[PDB]
């Protein structure tokens, strides 16, 4: 039951740093690479007394990669799994998709070939990338395309990072987002959106961190990944695997965009007084104030639901909580999905990391849902891509490196058709 | 059996400070949060050895709120329940009801939602506020409107602080009081007024304190509320819960306006010297000199009456005392209620707070009746409302904040209809 | 025969209970006291070497997780490793797995195992299958093996203790599709089916047992106790004997009407145990109670075609018969008119260890068709909009299979309705 993860971009591999720190501390693996048998899903027993992770850090700017090579985990990661280029894609999906991707795609691909060949019970692949940038969006799409044509049916879970509605870090995220989603629509099996402003709001409100940095965001993302992988790694009352989310959350092939929410995100002072119960932690996962994507599901209708329970959770309590949720009319489901829940229970509570701000808890819930507010998100991004495409601004870079206007137009119309799909299905 | 108390305004949360100090003292709960089953209706047991009150403090200015946050009861209250705004209504119903209240009302109500979700046997809400201010009047009324809409059937008691007839601390308070009473009619289930001059006179006469302050008034109000909820909290020979105030004291849907009295209010030396039997503590609770609303019941007719007893009280003595009250012709009941008393007996004597002035008493009485002098109070307030409304004084503030003259006129005619109702019912 | 996660867990608990009942330790050695335990060991166990008994069971699923959880716990050392039919790709609550996309390479090794296991015994009394009903491999491997088994061995009895799609909240979004298809196969191939659901078990732990956190351990213990009560008479003597075929012929008036709503008694809280008595009426009143059955089918909403009651312990047959007659007479409107004496009683003198008396109830009533319409309506809502169909249709078949099963499930509702 081995799962291998690929991190594309400066955003992907910092999330990888946080995730692999959490994995090393959770399985008791020292930073030099050895313990003082569940580790097989993340680490491979190489020789005797040495564990190497099943992941590849691939990027174009090598400064962060060699920082990883220089820091604490020199011995854990092996230098052949950390792919790094010489020059950046420079916030250009076009550059990283046609100019620089074509020379770096093959090396990462034939490394992942042997990484998967080492696996025996391969569950699937899962990706980390931000579509705002150039390397994560540009050659990430190409790598997804070639993974799909090389493997086809194996799961490719997408934990992407979309630009925030108001908070932005550059000017050309609309183009990159549209051009990446155009291919992610038909190649990614299940995609989970992650917004930076929403996690900022969670940190300000829940963890009361006045001056948060990307490390806290990455730690929260790692908590979510570990929560959705623990049932695979640890035995529980009702455990699920990776192939669940495909069948239980994707009614149509072109609708795979899942809103994520985690509960409880709570600080040490705030956790000191709340009697954590399955009912209230289930309740807190449904409100928009605890979602990882800046969108309001009240404007839409729920299409499916997946609930993950960790710690001291019995099926009685989740049954009661889900039943009470269904009885209330605050949330509503689409009329053709009478049974839209997918529950899973795990025994081991989430491990707390030294230096993390999340308080240790006895129980927690991780949510993967499907609604039609994603149609609001895509229309909101479509507005500000359309404004720029009105006067052909910044497209000279893309055209000059090797794209053409037809790809822009077809991606634009693909998102328009996706909008029509979203509003048609919710009827 | 659980009750959640909400406090609105500066006066509301000072009364809340006194009330929760007394509540922690009576149930043996240290201010840090833990003891060194009666506590259920006020505190919630979390984890192991930690109790959290079922209360919310809300206000628009942060001064008193973070004074509470800084004081001794820091670890008892927890940061979620102390709602604090940025700017106050500044003695303006319109500001706190239309401009500022619309942004703070949702946070209070969806905190109340989860507070009730924690509960299972919610008896009903009870509010603490003053109608003379801006925050307590406007957004307090808005919160009562939304609470009546969302829950409806559950009880909503009101302990308001109406302006004194001659003693005042503001100028535009007739406007605030009238506009708050206009919305308090169809939403408040039982309204118990508390006047400031009356309690000042009580302190000057009973406790012979020359120079009282607001803290003594809050202590007396907290003692009244404790003697009112002791029946829910503690076991008695004849107990009476919150739901009985509506049925036994409200004969008509729009007549819910109650007087309050307490006996005995005594010092240590006088407690040592004079005996405190049931007869005189019942007699002292019926004289107008021991009332918390500056009105004389001899000008009106008693329609209903409720009696609470604590400590060494046997039913035969309360029966004899209520009989002697009934036969004495100094007070007259309406023809329409031949049995107009509701007695309640509890075993627990009232507790004393060190540093206070009230001594340890074997038995105490808290009386809540309904009379016709409410018409006198409302007419006296309406007269000076109309005098100052004649010259269009201060109206520009209210119109600018988002009001107009239509609601002014309808509030005027609504208090006129209240006057007509109170006159016809007394005949 | 056990399939999937639910099948594996209930089978682990069932084998735990049975191994304790016959007095064999988790290492597989006999340490009992009475001589009645040995004489009917062969119905469940095989003597290997040096007085070691191994269960006649076939553990079988698609993922190593459930097998590892079963093997790690106590009484996990008794299962023979050769019976561990074992895949490597996974189920993921997916149809595809279980009849044409991921199960055929395991249906054959399990066929070899069950053939070698059935030919070892002299007179095989029947097959028993415990499996899930909302999963991918729990349904899949399980009732596909039921299909192939019926072709090879038609006369032998087939019993299925299925757990029907959870009733008020659904563990699986695609639960209607998996349940409807499994029921079409079950009506044609399975001889007799016991209907279970987690809702009734949760309610039982709520009210009767008054437990605070009833994990799957208690639910599987309930199901295992029910199983042992069903199969009790084969192992011990009694005043009136009845094996599986007895119940099948006295409970099934028509070949398609073999879905049973089941309960177990006594079930008392440890606080209320000091206050109850131990008599035949105390078993009958608790057995006929609607809040005790293990299915979401209210008997008051329908009519009882036939019923069965298997009693355990030293008891007077006259009292059992008069209690059955009294309960039949007083509730005269809930029993079908053209069929007298709808109840069958059987007495075994050996109760479960630590008890004096017990009873297990099997009731074939037309009130269970309520669940069939409830599931059919959910399938039609999904099928009309063709939701989740791509995961199933592209995996290697046609929509006609979906239509035929819906029509047969609909006919099954109608036949039960005719005798209402």
């Amino acid at each position: 039951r081995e799962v291998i993860s690929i991190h594309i971009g400066q955003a992907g591999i910092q999330v990888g740093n946080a995730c692999w720190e959490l994995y090393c501390l959770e399985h008791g693996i020292q930073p030099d690479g050895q313990m003082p048998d569940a580790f097989n899903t993340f680490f491979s027993e190489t020789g005797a007394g040495k564990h190497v992770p099943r992941c590849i850090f691939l990027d174009l700017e090598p400064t962060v990669v060699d920082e990883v090579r220089t820091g604490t985990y020199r011995q854990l990661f092996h230098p052949e799994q950390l792919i790094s280029g010489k020059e950046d894609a420079a916030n250009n999906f076009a550059r990283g998709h046609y100019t620089i991707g074509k020379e770096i795609v093959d090396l990462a691909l034939d490394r992942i070939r042997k990484l998967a060949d080492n696996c025996t019970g391969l569950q699937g692949f899962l990706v980390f990338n931000a579509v705002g940038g150039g390397t994560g969006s540009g050659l990430g799409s190409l790598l997804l395309e070639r993974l799909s044509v090389d493997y086809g049916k194996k799961s490719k879970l997408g934990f992407t990072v979309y630009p925030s509605p108001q908070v932005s870090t550059a000017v050309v995220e609309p183009y990159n987002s549209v051009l990446s989603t155009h291919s992610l629509l038909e190649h990614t099996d299940v995609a989970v959106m992650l917004d930076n402003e929403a996690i900022y709001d969670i940190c300000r409100r829940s963890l009361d961190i006045e001056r948060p940095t990307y490390t806290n965001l990455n730690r929260l993302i790692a908590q979510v990944i570990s929560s959705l992988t623990a049932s695979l790694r640890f035995d529980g009352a009702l455990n699920v695997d990776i192939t669940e989310f495909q069948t239980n959350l994707v009614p149509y092939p072109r609708i795979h965009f899942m809103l994520s929410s985690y509960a409880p995100i709570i600080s040490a002072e705030k956790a000191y007084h709340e009697q954590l119960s399955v009912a209230e932690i289930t309740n807190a996962a449904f409100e928009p104030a605890s979602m990882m994507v800046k969108c309001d599901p009240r404007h839409g209708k729920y299409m499916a639901c997946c609930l993950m329970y960790r710690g001291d959770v019995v099926p009685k309590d989740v049954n009661a909580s889900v039943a009470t949720i269904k009885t209330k009319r605050t949330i509503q489901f689409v009329d053709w999905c009478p049974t839209g829940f997918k529950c899973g229970i795990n025994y081991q509570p989430p491990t707390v990391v030294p230096g993390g701000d999340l308080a240790k808890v006895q129980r927690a819930v991780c949510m993967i849902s499907n609604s039609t507010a994603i149609g609001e998100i895509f229309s909101r991004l479509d507005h500000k891509f359309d404004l720029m495409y009105a006067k052909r601004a910044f497209v000279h870079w893309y055209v000059g490196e090797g794209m053409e206007e037809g790809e822009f137009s077809e991606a634009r119309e693909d998102l328009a058709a996706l909008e029509k799909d979203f509003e048609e299905v919710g009827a | 059996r659980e009750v959640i108390s909400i406090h609105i305004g500066q006066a509301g949360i000072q009364v809340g400070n006194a009330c929760w100090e007394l509540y922690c003292l009576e149930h043996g709960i240290q201010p840090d949060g833990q003891m060194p089953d009666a506590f259920n209706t006020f505190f919630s047991e979390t984890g192991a050895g930690k109790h959290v009150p079922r209360c919310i403090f809300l206000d628009l200015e942060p001064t008193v709120v973070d004074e509470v946050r800084t004081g001794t009861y820091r670890q008892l209250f927890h940061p979620e329940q102390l709602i604090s705004g940025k700017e106050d209504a500044a003695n303006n119903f319109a500001r706190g009801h239309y401009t500022i209240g619309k942004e703070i009302v949702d946070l209070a109500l969806d905190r109340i939602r989860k507070l009730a979700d924690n509960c299972t046997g919610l008896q009903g809400f009870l509010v603490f506020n003053a109608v003379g201010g801006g925050t307590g009047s406007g957004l307090g009324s808005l919160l009562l409107e939304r609470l009546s809409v969302d829950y409806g059937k559950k009880s909503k008691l009101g302990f308001t602080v109406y302006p004194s007839p001659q003693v005042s601390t503001a100028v535009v308070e007739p406007y605030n009081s009238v506009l708050s009473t206009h919305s308090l009619l169809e939403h408040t289930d039982v309204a118990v007024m508390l006047d400031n001059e009356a309690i000042y006179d009580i302190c000057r006469r009973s406790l012979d304190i020359e120079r009282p302050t607001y803290t003594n008034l809050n202590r007396l109000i907290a003692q009244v509320i404790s003697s009112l909820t002791a029946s829910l909290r503690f076991d008695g020979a004849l107990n009476v819960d919150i739901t009985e105030f509506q049925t036994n004291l409200v004969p008509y849907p729009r007549i819910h306006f109650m007087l309050s009295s307490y006996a005995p209010i005594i010092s240590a030396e006088k407690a040592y010297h004079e005996q405190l039997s049931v007869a005189e503590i019942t007699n002292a609770a019926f004289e107008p000199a021991s009332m918390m609303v500056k009105c004389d019941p001899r000008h009106g007719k008693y329609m209903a009456c409720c009696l609470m007893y604590r400590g060494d009280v046997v039913p035969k003595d309360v029966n004899a005392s209520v009989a002697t009250i009934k036969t004495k012709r100094t007070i007259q009941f309406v023809d329409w209620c031949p049995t107009g008393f509701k007695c309640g007996i509890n075993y627990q004597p009232p507790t004393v707070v060190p540093g206070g002035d009230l001594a340890k008493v074997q038995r105490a009485v808290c009386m809540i009746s309904n009379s016709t002098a409410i018409g006198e109070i409302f007419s006296r307030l309406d007269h000076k409302f109309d005098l100052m409304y004649a010259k269009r004084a201060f109206v520009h503030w209210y119109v600018g904040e988002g009001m107009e003259e239509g609601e002014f006129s309808e509030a005027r005619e609504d208090l006129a209809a209240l006057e007509k109702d109170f006159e016809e019912v007394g005949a | 025969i056990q399939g999937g996660q639910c099948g594996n867990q209930i089978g682990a608990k069932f084998w735990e209970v049975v191994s304790d009942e016959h007095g064999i330790d988790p290492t597989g050695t006999y340490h009992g006291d009475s001589d009645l335990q040995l004489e009917r060991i062969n119905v469940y166990f095989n003597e290997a070497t040096g007085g070691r008994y191994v269960p006649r069971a076939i553990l079988m699923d698609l993922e190593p997780g459930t097998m590892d959880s079963v093997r790690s716990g106590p009484y996990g050392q008794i299962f023979r490793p050769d019976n561990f039919v074992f895949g490597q790709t996974g189920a993921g609550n997916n149809w595809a797995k279980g009849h044409y996309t991921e199960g055929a390479e395991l249906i054959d090794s399990v066929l070899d195992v069950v053939r070698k296991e059935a030919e070892s015994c002299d007179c095989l009394q029947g097959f028993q299958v415990c499996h899930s009903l909302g999963g991918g491999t729990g349904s899949g491997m399980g009732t596909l093996l039921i299909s192939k088994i019926r072709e090879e061995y038609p006369d032998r009895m087939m019993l299925t203790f299925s757990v029907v799609p959870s009733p008020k909240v659904s563990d699986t979004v695609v639960e209607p599709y998996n349940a409807t298809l499994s029921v079409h196969q079950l009506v044609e191939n399975a001889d007799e089916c016991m209907v279970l659901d987690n809702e009734a078990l949760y309610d039982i732990c709520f009210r009767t047992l008054k437990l605070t956190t009833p994990t799957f351990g208690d639910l599987n213990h309930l199901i295992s106790a029910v199983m042992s009560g069903i199969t009790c008479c084969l192992r011990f003597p009694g005043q009136l004997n009845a094996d599986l075929r007895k119940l099948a012929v006295n409970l099934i008036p028509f070949p398609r009407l073999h879905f049973f709503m089941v309960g177990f008694t006594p079930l008392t809280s440890r606080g209320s145990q000091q206050y109850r008595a131990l008599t035949v009426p105390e078993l009958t009143q608790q057995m006929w109670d609607a809040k005790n059955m293990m299915c979401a089918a209210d008997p008051r909403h329908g009519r009882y075609l036939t019923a069965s009651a298997l009693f355990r312990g030293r008891m007077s047959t006259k009292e059992v018969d008069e209690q059955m007659l009294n309960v039949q007479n007083k509730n005269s409107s809930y029993f079908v008119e053209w069929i007298p004496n709808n109840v069958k009683s059987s007495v075994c003198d050996i109760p479960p260890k630590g008890l004096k008396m017990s009873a297990t109830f099997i009731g074939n009533s037309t009130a269970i068709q309520e669940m069939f319409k409830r599931v059919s309506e959910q399938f039609t809502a999904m099928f009309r909009r063709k939701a989740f169909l791509h995961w199933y249709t592209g995996e290697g078949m046609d929509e006609m299979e979906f239509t035929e099963a819906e029509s047969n499930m609909n006919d099954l509702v109608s036949e039960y309705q005719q005798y209402q």
Partner: peptide, 27 residues
């Protein structure tokens, strides 16, 4: 008036290329 202004709910304009239909089968 900034506080009391009513909210507006309109799609914030796109190209004239609104003609594309959903790629899903209609029902």
């Amino acid at each position: 008036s900034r506080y009391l202004q009513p909210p507006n709910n309109e799609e914030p304009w796109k190209m004239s290329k609104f003609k594309t239909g959903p790629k899903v089968t209609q029902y």
